[PDB]
Amino acid sequence: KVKIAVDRNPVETSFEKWAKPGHFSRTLSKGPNTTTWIWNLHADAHDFDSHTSDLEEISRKVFSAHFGQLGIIFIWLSGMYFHGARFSNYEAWLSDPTHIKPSAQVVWPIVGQEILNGDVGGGFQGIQITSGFFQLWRASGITSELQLYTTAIGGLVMAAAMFFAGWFHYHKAAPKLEWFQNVESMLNHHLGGLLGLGSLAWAGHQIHVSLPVNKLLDAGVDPKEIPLPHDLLLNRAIMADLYPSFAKGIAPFFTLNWSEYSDFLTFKGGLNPVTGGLWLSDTAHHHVAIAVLFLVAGHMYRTNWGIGHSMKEILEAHRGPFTGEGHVGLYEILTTSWHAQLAINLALFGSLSIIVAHHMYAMPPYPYLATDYGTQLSLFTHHTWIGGFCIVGAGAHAAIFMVRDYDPTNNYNNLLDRVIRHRDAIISHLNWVCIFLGFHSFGLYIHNDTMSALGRPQDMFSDTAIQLQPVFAQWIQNTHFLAPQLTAPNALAATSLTWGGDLVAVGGKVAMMPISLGTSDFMVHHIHAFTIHVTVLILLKGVLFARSSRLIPDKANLGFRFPCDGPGRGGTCQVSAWDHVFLGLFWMYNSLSIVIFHFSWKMQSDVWGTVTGVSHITGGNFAQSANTINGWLRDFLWAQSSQVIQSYGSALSAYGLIFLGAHFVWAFSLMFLFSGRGYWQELIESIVWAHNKLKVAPAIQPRALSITQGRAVGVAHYLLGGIATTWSFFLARIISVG
Amino acid sequence: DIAGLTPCSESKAYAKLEKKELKTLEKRLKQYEADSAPAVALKATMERTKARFANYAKAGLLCGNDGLPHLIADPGLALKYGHAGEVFIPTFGFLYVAGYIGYVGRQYLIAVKGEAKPTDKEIIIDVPLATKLAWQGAGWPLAAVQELQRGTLLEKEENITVSPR
Amino acid sequence: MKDFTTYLSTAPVIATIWFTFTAGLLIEINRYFPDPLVF
Amino acid sequence: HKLFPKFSQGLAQDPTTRRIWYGLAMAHDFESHDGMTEENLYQKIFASHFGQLS
Amino acid sequence: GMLETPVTSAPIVATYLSNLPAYRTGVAPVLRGVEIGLAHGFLLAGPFIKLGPLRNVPETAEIAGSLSAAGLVLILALCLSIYGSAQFQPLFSADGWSEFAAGFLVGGEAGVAWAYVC
Amino acid sequence: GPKRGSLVKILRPESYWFNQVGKVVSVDQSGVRYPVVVRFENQNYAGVTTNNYALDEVVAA
Amino acid sequence: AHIVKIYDTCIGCTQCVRACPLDVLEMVPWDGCKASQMASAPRTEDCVGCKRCETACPTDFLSVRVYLGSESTRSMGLSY
Amino acid sequence: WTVPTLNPDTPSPIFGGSTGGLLRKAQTEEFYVITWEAKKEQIFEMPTGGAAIMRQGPNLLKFGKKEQCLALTTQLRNKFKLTPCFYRVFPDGKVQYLHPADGVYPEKVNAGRVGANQNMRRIGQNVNPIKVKFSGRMMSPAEI
Ligand code: CLA
Ligand code: CLA
Ligand code: CLA
Ligand code: CLA
Ligand code: CLA
Ligand code: CLA
Ligand code: CLA
Ligand code: CLA
């Protein structure tokens, strides 16, 4: 029986526990004796497993926490809309998108920082934004600042509702454990109601507001002169003036004569040629199809009536001869362990974000987006980074499950058990394939460097010497370009210009052209494969050996996060799964930095540029230069950092400052990464003596950071430094040459 | 003058840099309307630029061969040639405020060590006692030299040391 | 209310209030007295 | 066990690859070899300084 | 125990591994060496010819490829000899491994010489 | 030796609380080598606030 | 083999014994402390030098000390 | 109490076979063999990875190092309240009993034990490294 189950008034709303730091932990509620306490207080603040053993209380805590997160995000969205309405040039940009730079941040005139308010056009001065909100707002049909202001107030109201919902569902009416364990009902409601009704209501908004307003905006009529959306809902005769299908109403829908809705539910493909974005009619049909699909999908699992599937029965039904008991026991694991769920959801959520990056660069969904090169670079890079971080998190929480929640006396000869039982074979094969990939992928680059340096270019791996053509990718590309003719008859064009074909340009700039693939693309793709495989190796090794290894047979009893097991047995530093997350973080940074460099150079070289033929931003140097390390060093890094290094005295000077600052923070991380806390503790001893001499020794004893906190501080400053460096480089480059 | 440096009111590269910055600001200015907000902001920027160059030439700063103000850090040379307001008066101003902060922190520590929970007062600040010591710390150099002369500024050799001392 | 002022007496809250006061005092000084290099 | 390194039988009884690296890294630290006296120390230092000269 | 697997414990795989010359248990180490050398030198003659630095100069690509292959076979035979000198202090003995390394040298040079004719 | 509750001073040089002040808990009257039990208000690097000392390692100061 | 020593500041709390992952230490009769128990290290040939014993000891300073000496196959923790 | 003997015909726990098992150290140097008597049939965690059902009665497992046998001993002793003992086996067939070599577990005092490696002094009363220079080897000053 699926029903609402709630306990009344569990936790009194009181300011008492605000005044007692570390109340949540029996160890930390004793008070601070040394400085380590503070760090512990913040590190274990949200580790609810270390607070209680009771799954119900933990579940309630995570529920209200999620509400807090949603309220924060709503505050953030409210801020973006309010700043877009009050401190922007959005209307001016609407009147001239091709020659006005999107700006929605202005600085105050103090200490000379006023110079950052640059000439972005439209009679405005501010910081040019690259988040892409302007294109999203134009695509949604927003025309005035008033509507943005109203959206800001609405989002603030929703933030207040989310914080009230958090307080309410923790302190007043907090759900019971068997409410949270209704996973079949949760999937039904989220697949129907969330994704399904979400895309249904959005398709409603599109068909009724987006399509007419953007059709008029593409027609050329002044935005203020375009009818307001409520007049588009109210008087259907205007909707019939743009698309005569609307004259017949919803009569073709119920009578199944859906073909008459082909005015606004299309299958054109390609891009809008005057606008450089996907057709909103294609997007409307897409969201209608997505809606119907998800609402069908949301009626799959049995709840309070006989019909519907059961998750444990589907899992226990798939058993073979090679795997033994198969998927038995997995339902119990995924309905009692939050960390397993978090690992799965983080992996797929990160992967999904990377897919979002690729599909949004390749098939520009917003108008005047493809030619806002800064926005495209920013969006791709951003969502790729977010993706990578969520994948590393997935590996982390997988390992946390493996140490804290794994219990083999309910999990005995299972898929998980066999994985743990042949982990040596898995890791050794992954090891070998990583070394193989490293040798041949990186070795081609080193080979080319040597041959080019020795004056023998005919012996290189290139398009003119020893060729290594991406035959398979070229074949898939050609097939997808020829797809509208035979295997997709109702498609007018291909799904993306990059497959092949003509060229769509807007305002003299290239929106998208066919992307060619040669030896350089072969080499970078195998570099990507190598780095990804190594990252998977580290993380997977971390999760498979989290409990035990031949080195530490009882590693599980030492916890998930611990520094080592002493200098014996040769040395056991970084044996914990946490340390494997730490190394996977560095390798994830490596991989995604090479990925975004690939994207940046390739787009600036073979795609972007002006139309007179097409003059590219870097003239097409990718195909001959991206085969040597010196080529990346000179033609990419050195050449394209001109803009960042000479940005002083202009509006881009902040990117130079953050270039230097990011380099500094990156180097600053090396002190934590390369050293150890014994030295620092002894140094602190001397300093403590000096403070004792002058009666200024604190009652809370100064302690050097822990080993694991030294590693954490190290990797955090390392990531912040490197990522912010590439951020400043990218933004200054693409804003100046864009 | 000092070290072969010309005064900034006499330096030519100083006036050249002033004219160059005004030229950059008016090249940014000449692409707007007359009474618009970017025009008002850039005219306020030009006003502050002219006022800043007039104030630096007024104060008797020394410029080099590039037209930039140079500072003199020697007490007697700066007191002799009238450059005491750039290092000497700033260094005694800094020593006043830095010793203020240090003396207020030291008095807070000695005030909270004499209780049953010194660490609990270190985490959660006694705000009235902190404000009382913050207002009383204006006579910190007098109280500092008095604690120096009584021998109560220093702890004796009851300090913590290592076995080879 | 006693516990709310005890929470406001904690270290990061007072550090936030005090650095907001100090930074705002420096910002108002650099506004009304633009660009001081000497004296 | 093995011969190398001939100055340390604690390293010579090492069954691992640690023996090679620690025989390389401890070859010229004569004060902590097996059976090293003080006259032997000064004599090997004097001959080693001749080797550097050559 | 050891993990039971249809790759590690297949019958036809076990017979195929028993038929290869590293496992026949009763043939001479010289015969094992010459068979392993005739396999490996013949396969190693290839990429030095097709991809080496003289691959595009006619009439000399196969000569330099086979000559570099013979040099590599000599290096491999020296490696076998020092491995046997360090390891043992019929195939797993000092005399047997020295006969095996000499047989590998002879068979590898013969395989390279037969690949030059082919 | 010293009495319960009295303040003593530690002269063991390889101790964390050398040249510092603690409080006597108990003195064992057997033939134990280190009978003086002294608690300290601050903890060492191992998180311990109690150590045993000899008679010539404590001075009631 | 590593060098493990026990010093007379031991109070026979048995913490070091229950911390060793290799069973090297044991408690013997003694008369030097109130607990009438002292640690002893009769099997230092199996000691790897992990120093869990030193972590478990409450005394200041340590009453058990591990001096990393010459490595063997047992002290390196090798299963191969 | 007398020293027990190894029965090689003791039934092993129910286990499908891991990759973390024995290696050539078991054939060339030594391998260690653990034995306990169980009260009921119950799943435990193998220290080399995976789950295993123990049999009711005697059980027998062989590991590669001593720490694996201590980890299984600690698991079977703290979680299941059992009394195991693990031996040392050489490829000749030589059997060396240990843990508990006294018969009583070392975490409690027993008469008859002789204290080894006990310095009867403090740690601050060690000599300086100048006093032990030019011996036959490296010496820490705590060796004397
Ligand atoms: C406004 C009235 C109010 C009051 C008096 C309380 C009081 C309490 N809550 Mg409740 N609760 C409330 C509203 C309130 N809550 C709201 C709005 C939510 C949804 C978030 C919750 C959800 C909730 C959960 C899940 C839990 C509590 C718990 C508690 C108890 C202890 C927590 C504590 O003392 O740390 C006080 C914490 C803070 C003062 C820090 C707030 C952190 C904010 C939310 C994060 C956002 C800051 C933001 C990111 C800015 C950062 C900028 C930059 C520097 C990064 C205490 C009785 C806990 C408990 O009962 O344990 C036994 C517990 O687990 N509350
Ligand atoms: C959520 C993200 C977000 C971010 C990053 C920004 C960022 C900015 N805003 Mg925007 N804004 C936002 C959301 C955001 N805003 C929202 C949701 C609204 C509607 C309420 C606004 C309405 C708004 C206006 C009207 C203005 C800005 C302005 C600014 C700029 C300067 C801010 C400043 O100096 O304030 C002043 C600094 C302070 C008030 C510091 C005091 C902090 C206190 C002391 C902390 C005390 C700690 C306490 C426990 C926690 C806070 C509790 C809270 C209830 C007070 C800065 C770019 C200004 C601007 O753009 O100028 C051109 C401006 O005029 N914002
Ligand atoms: C069809 C109804 C429905 C909808 C739309 C949702 C939607 C959501 N649930 Mg789910 N939930 C449902 C039924 C539903 N739930 C049922 C029946 C159960 C019990 C089996 C759960 C148990 C559950 C748990 C344990 C959690 C969620 C969470 C979430 C949020 C995921 C965050 C996100 O990406 O959304 C995008 C964000 C939005 C779309 C914002 C709009 C949200 C508003 C409130 C509309 C959603 C409708 C809402 C359910 C109606 C509430 C009415 C209320 C006044 C009584 C999302 C808002 C997670 C969460 O974040 O909690 C805070 C979470 O931890 N749900
Ligand atoms: C999912 C979101 C969504 C929403 C909200 C709408 C809404 C609408 N569509 Mg649209 N439509 C959609 C998706 C959506 N559509 C999609 C996906 C397609 C493609 C197939 C279309 C294709 C389409 C066409 C071709 C047309 C519409 C039309 C309409 C309008 C009239 C429909 C109607 O008569 O419904 C039936 C009436 C109701 C459902 C009434 C609602 C119930 C009321 C509010 C209850 C009130 C009860 C309460 C007690 C009384 C108030 C008391 C209070 C004052 C105190 C309406 C604004 C028509 C139009 O006007 O176009 C401009 C039209 O011609 N739609
Ligand atoms: C650029 C510096 C650098 C290099 C060369 C390496 C190299 C490697 N890392 Mg390391 N890593 C690095 C930075 C680097 N890392 C940093 C900064 C960290 C700290 C975050 C790490 C942390 C780390 C982790 C956690 C892991 C690695 C692993 C590896 C190995 C991957 C396997 C492989 O591809 O083999 C191929 C070898 C190469 C690509 C090296 C260059 C080979 C050249 C080009 C050809 C060799 C022929 C040579 C020229 C002949 C010389 C002859 C001469 C001696 C006479 C590889 C040796 C992984 C591993 O070992 O698992 C498989 C692994 O898991 N590293
Ligand atoms: C940090 C170290 C330092 C150094 C390297 C200098 C360097 C100098 N001092 Mg300065 N000064 C300093 C700190 C320093 N000062 C401090 C802390 C005070 C406050 C006590 C002064 C107060 C002071 C006065 C009143 C005068 C100088 C002068 C000078 C210049 C020549 C001095 C000389 O020839 O004697 C050798 C240098 C030293 C012994 C170093 C210590 C300087 C002492 C404190 C003063 C020496 C003054 C000198 C005897 C008078 C020379 C008269 C001149 C006309 C020849 C020389 C550039 C003189 C000047 O203006 O020349 C143009 C001068 O009249 N200084
Ligand atoms: C002036 C003459 C001199 C003499 C006679 C000595 C003698 C000694 N030193 Mg001292 N020392 C010296 C100068 C000297 N040192 C200098 C210049 C440095 C700074 C580098 C040091 C820093 C130093 C340290 C930190 C230590 C010693 C130690 C020692 C003792 C043992 C050395 C040993 O066995 O290691 C054998 C040496 C090696 C195996 C060297 C390995 C190779 C090194 C890392 C350089 C690798 C770079 C490589 C060659 C580059 C190739 C590039 C490629 C592309 C071509 C011996 C008493 C050790 C000691 O006393 O222990 C208690 C010890 O720990 N020395
Ligand atoms: C690792 C990547 C890599 C690759 C693929 C190459 C490839 C090449 N190099 Mg380059 N080289 C490299 C790295 C690499 N190099 C690096 C890092 C350096 C600097 C140290 C150089 C410096 C260099 C120089 C100076 C020269 C070359 C040359 C060459 C060419 C011929 C080499 C040769 O004849 O070897 C012989 C080839 C083999 C022995 C092949 C062995 C590998 C086999 C195929 C593996 C088989 C596995 C099989 C599938 C398993 C089946 C199992 C089953 C039977 C059971 C060839 C194109 C030569 C040239 O002229 O360039 C055109 C040349 O003069 N290289």
Side-chain angles (χ1 to χ4, degrees), chain H residues 4 13 16 26 29 32 41 59 64 69 78 82 89 92 105 109-110 118 139 144:
Chain H
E29 293 182 354
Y32 296 4
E41 183 177 2
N59 289 317
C69 295
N78 287 321
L82 297 175
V89 179
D92 197 4
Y105 290 91
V109 66
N110 191 5
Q118 290 178 354
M139 291 183 70
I144 61 170

Side-chain angles (χ1 to χ4, degrees), chain A residues 75-76 78-80 82-83 87 105-108 156, chain C residues 13 16-17 20:
Chain A
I75 289 169
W76 174 70
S78 177
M80 302 305 97
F82 184 86
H83 280 255
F87 304 112
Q105 178 178 357
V106 195
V107 307
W108 287 329
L156 187 51
Chain C
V13 179
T16 299
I17 294 168
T20 302

Side-chain angles (χ1 to χ4, degrees), chain A residues 471-493:
Chain A
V471 55
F472 302 136
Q474 290 168 355
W475 184 92
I476 295 188
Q477 193 187 1
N478 182 12
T479 300
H480 287 173
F481 173 65
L482 299 181
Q485 294 177 356
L486 293 174
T487 58
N490 293 318
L492 296 175

Side-chain angles (χ1 to χ4, degrees), chain A residues 41 69 132 177 276 284 443 462 583 601 645 672 721:
Chain A
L41 169 59
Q69 170 69 97
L177 177 58
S462 70
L583 297 170
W601 203 359
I645 65 186
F672 295 90

Side-chain angles (χ1 to χ4, degrees), chain A residues 431 434-435 438-439 442 446 530 534 537-538 583 586-587:
Chain A
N431 190 349
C434 283
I435 307 180
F439 276 142
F442 183 69
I446 301 305
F530 164 59
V534 176
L537 173 66
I538 307 158
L583 297 170
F586 289 100
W587 266 91

Side-chain angles (χ1 to χ4, degrees), chain E residues 58-84:
Chain E
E59 192 182 1
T60 63
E62 190 173 5
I63 295 171
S66 296
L67 202 281
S68 61
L72 192 143
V73 168
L74 182 62
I75 294 169
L76 293 175
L78 192 148
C79 290
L80 293 172
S81 179
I82 62 171
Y83 176 76

